[PDB]
Design an enzyme around this catalytic site. Structure first.
Site, PDB file in Angstrom:
ATOM      1  N   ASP A   1      70.482  68.035  60.126  1.00  0.00           N
ATOM      2  CA  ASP A   1      70.087  69.068  61.073  1.00  0.00           C
ATOM      3  C   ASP A   1      69.675  68.555  62.451  1.00  0.00           C
ATOM      4  O   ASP A   1      69.061  69.284  63.226  1.00  0.00           O
ATOM      5  CB  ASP A   1      68.981  69.960  60.489  1.00  0.00           C
ATOM      6  CG  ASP A   1      67.607  69.324  60.557  1.00  0.00           C
ATOM      7  OD1 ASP A   1      67.512  68.078  60.576  1.00  0.00           O
ATOM      8  OD2 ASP A   1      66.616  70.084  60.582  1.00  0.00           O
TER       9      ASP A   1
ATOM     10  N   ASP B   1      61.816  65.907  57.681  1.00  0.00           N
ATOM     11  CA  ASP B   1      60.673  66.799  57.494  1.00  0.00           C
ATOM     12  C   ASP B   1      59.727  66.380  56.394  1.00  0.00           C
ATOM     13  O   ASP B   1      60.145  65.876  55.350  1.00  0.00           O
ATOM     14  CB  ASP B   1      61.158  68.222  57.224  1.00  0.00           C
ATOM     15  CG  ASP B   1      62.018  68.745  58.333  1.00  0.00           C
ATOM     16  OD1 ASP B   1      61.693  68.456  59.494  1.00  0.00           O
ATOM     17  OD2 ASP B   1      63.005  69.438  58.055  1.00  0.00           O
TER      18      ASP B   1
ATOM     19  N   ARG C   1      58.716  81.934  68.720  1.00  0.00           N
ATOM     20  CA  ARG C   1      59.194  82.096  67.357  1.00  0.00           C
ATOM     21  C   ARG C   1      58.058  81.889  66.358  1.00  0.00           C
ATOM     22  O   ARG C   1      57.343  80.884  66.415  1.00  0.00           O
ATOM     23  CB  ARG C   1      60.300  81.087  67.045  1.00  0.00           C
ATOM     24  CG  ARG C   1      60.727  81.098  65.582  1.00  0.00           C
ATOM     25  CD  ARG C   1      61.610  79.914  65.243  1.00  0.00           C
ATOM     26  NE  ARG C   1      61.800  79.789  63.797  1.00  0.00           N
ATOM     27  CZ  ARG C   1      62.225  78.688  63.186  1.00  0.00           C
ATOM     28  NH1 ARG C   1      62.510  77.599  63.887  1.00  0.00           N
ATOM     29  NH2 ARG C   1      62.357  78.674  61.869  1.00  0.00           N
TER      30      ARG C   1
ATOM     31  N   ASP D   1      68.758  69.034  55.127  1.00  0.00           N
ATOM     32  CA  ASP D   1      67.428  69.190  55.663  1.00  0.00           C
ATOM     33  C   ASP D   1      66.346  68.791  54.660  1.00  0.00           C
ATOM     34  O   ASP D   1      65.505  69.603  54.273  1.00  0.00           O
ATOM     35  CB  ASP D   1      67.288  70.653  56.091  1.00  0.00           C
ATOM     36  CG  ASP D   1      66.124  70.878  56.998  1.00  0.00           C
ATOM     37  OD1 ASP D   1      65.725  69.912  57.668  1.00  0.00           O
ATOM     38  OD2 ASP D   1      65.622  72.013  57.050  1.00  0.00           O
TER      39      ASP D   1
ATOM     40  N   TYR E   1      53.073  79.067  56.563  1.00  0.00           N
ATOM     41  CA  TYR E   1      53.494  77.836  55.891  1.00  0.00           C
ATOM     42  C   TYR E   1      52.527  77.532  54.753  1.00  0.00           C
ATOM     43  O   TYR E   1      51.324  77.743  54.889  1.00  0.00           O
ATOM     44  CB  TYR E   1      53.505  76.659  56.875  1.00  0.00           C
ATOM     45  CG  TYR E   1      54.768  76.590  57.695  1.00  0.00           C
ATOM     46  CD1 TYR E   1      55.025  77.526  58.695  1.00  0.00           C
ATOM     47  CD2 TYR E   1      55.743  75.631  57.420  1.00  0.00           C
ATOM     48  CE1 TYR E   1      56.222  77.511  59.402  1.00  0.00           C
ATOM     49  CE2 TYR E   1      56.945  75.609  58.115  1.00  0.00           C
ATOM     50  CZ  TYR E   1      57.177  76.551  59.104  1.00  0.00           C
ATOM     51  OH  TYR E   1      58.364  76.539  59.796  1.00  0.00           O
TER      52      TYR E   1
END
Ligand SMILES: [F-]
Ligand SMILES: [F-]
Ligand SMILES: [Mn+2]
Ligand SMILES: [Mn+2]
Ligand SMILES: [Mn+2]
Ligand SMILES: [Mn+2]
Ligand SMILES: [Mn+2]
Ligand SMILES: [Mn+2]
Ligand SMILES: [Mn+2]
Ligand SMILES: [Mn+2]
Ligand code: NA
Lengths: 284, 282
Positions: B115, B120, B78, B152, B89
């Site tokens: 999630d 994160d 992926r 998230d 990113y």
């Protein structure tokens, strides 16, 4: 068939990339035809800088056969800095061979002398190109960048092999399928030298992206400037090496030049100083 | 000292990056202390994705010691697509170890379950990080991202070694020194999955980046959630591998797990399909 001959490791002063025609090196500046298909307006672009990279690689004017080498400033390898929200170059960056931004005459549209280099090309296709690559592109438009006070047109083009090529006919199409790109392009070229301590650049026509026909007109004019240059009739060729191996009627034609080029000696890319990672948050 | 043990070539299905402490593999999820300096709220950030790359590398919850492995998609790897004007990113992407976005309960601020993943972290420093890197960062703020309907959170942080770390102390400083980064961050997470057929994401608080104080509270909450998880006291650990080699009072403590990891077998990066070059205009 065009291929590349690499000498040395990328990101070093010894790095050189010569363009070969059927295995034999030719001048990337003078021996690659401007037109791939003249009447269909298809040009041969010489790619120098892949999209999203920093090393300012350029066809060198002062070396025989004009190989692509890395530009330098104050004796150091030159890397274009990252200017938010951009990462390195936002287009596959290159030039059109057999063209010249004449530095000896003030160009009327921009009211400034040319920057002494082949006309610049921004290829917007999806695929990231490679240095030394000769790809066929169609001109979509052109921007009149005054770079450090010199006429420095930027042609907007697309690889004819790109999936969207068939839908891209003129400059308005770029805004339709690549919304925001032209504005980002204007911004990019205005501010990319600010991290180097240089002033913001400017565009004529308020940064308007002139259309395909306008683009063809400028391209052709720079091609004529080059015709005079290669014929040895410029009032000042600036030390540009005019050696070529495919134009027998020119004063500087030289068959031997090709065989004098060293064989390939490609090495792995050399490391790049971590400072090049830095994202600059600047603006005009 | 933290180092990395790489298995295979980057960009391949066999690639794994384990984090090592004094040469021994430890769990990237459970064994790395959340705090490098608790008193000063300096956190240990596990870096998964270097800025401007596409490979969606992630700490693997279901594998022992939780090595970083590239997420898969239909038998292949992926990659996050490039969404104009961004290249991959736009931040060094990772997470804080010993944290968990509890999927078993709905979160008050976002009104959605977590999630199931460590919280994160978006590290905004100038230097591009490396996968498996454990860097120390200062928390500056946090964004309430609802990714595909799940809580998230995205912590905004800065490497304490960054030349600007001294001047970056709260969320307002991000706009002061990195103008546009926060707006771009909001946009990035809203649209990055659209090329994959997913709906645009949304943020609570109109996408406002809450400040450090607020961020510290959320981080503490995800840490408490993990404390429950690692103690084996969650009502449902969702098959997460809780094996660890530094928490001897946990049910899943097992030092032998470190010794079970094969040696490094680092190979040159494998090439990435040219289709990943594509720039999407969303
Ligand atoms: F140029
Ligand atoms: F996550
Ligand atoms: Mn130049
Ligand atoms: Mn040029
Ligand atoms: Mn220029
Ligand atoms: Mn130029
Ligand atoms: Mn994920
Ligand atoms: Mn995560
Ligand atoms: Mn997510
Ligand atoms: Mn997450
Ligand atoms: Na130039």
């Amino acid at each position: 068939t065009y291929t590349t001959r690499q000498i040395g490791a990328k990101n070093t002063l010894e790095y050189k990339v010569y363009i070969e025609k059927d295995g034999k090196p030719v001048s990337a500046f003078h021996d690659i035809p401007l037109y791939a298909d003249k009447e269909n307006n298809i040009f041969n672009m010489v790619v120098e800088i892949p999209r999203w990279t920093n090393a300012k690689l350029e066809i060198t004017k002062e070396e025989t056969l004009n190989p692509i080498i890395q530009d330098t400033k104050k004796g150091k390898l030159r890397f274009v800095r990252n200017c938010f929200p951009h990462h390195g170059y936002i287009h596959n960056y290159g030039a059109f061979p057999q063209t010249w931004e004449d530095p000896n005459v003030s160009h009327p549209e921009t009211k400034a002398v040319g920057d002494n280099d082949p006309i610049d090309v921004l290829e917007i296709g999806e695929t990231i190109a490679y240095t030394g690559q000769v790809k066929q592109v169609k001109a979509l438009g052109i921007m009149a960048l005054l770079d450090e006070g010199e006429t420095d047109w930027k042609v907007i083009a697309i690889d004819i092999n790109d999936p969207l090529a068939p839908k891209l006919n003129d400059i308005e199409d770029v805004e339709k399928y690549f919304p925001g790109l032209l504005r980002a392009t204007n911004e990019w070229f205005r501010i990319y030298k600010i991290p180097d301590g240089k002033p913001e650049n400017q565009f004529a026509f308020s940064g308007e992206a002139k259309n395909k026909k306008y683009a063809l007109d400028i391209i052709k004019e720079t091609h004529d400037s080059w015709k005079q240059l290669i014929a040895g009739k410029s009032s000042d060729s600036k030390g540009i090496d005019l050696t070529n191996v495919t134009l027998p009627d020119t004063p500087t034609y030289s068959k031997a030049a090709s065989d004098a080029i060293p064989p390939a000696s490609l090495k792995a890319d050399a490391p790049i100083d971590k400072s090049i990672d830095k994202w600059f948050f600047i603006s005009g």
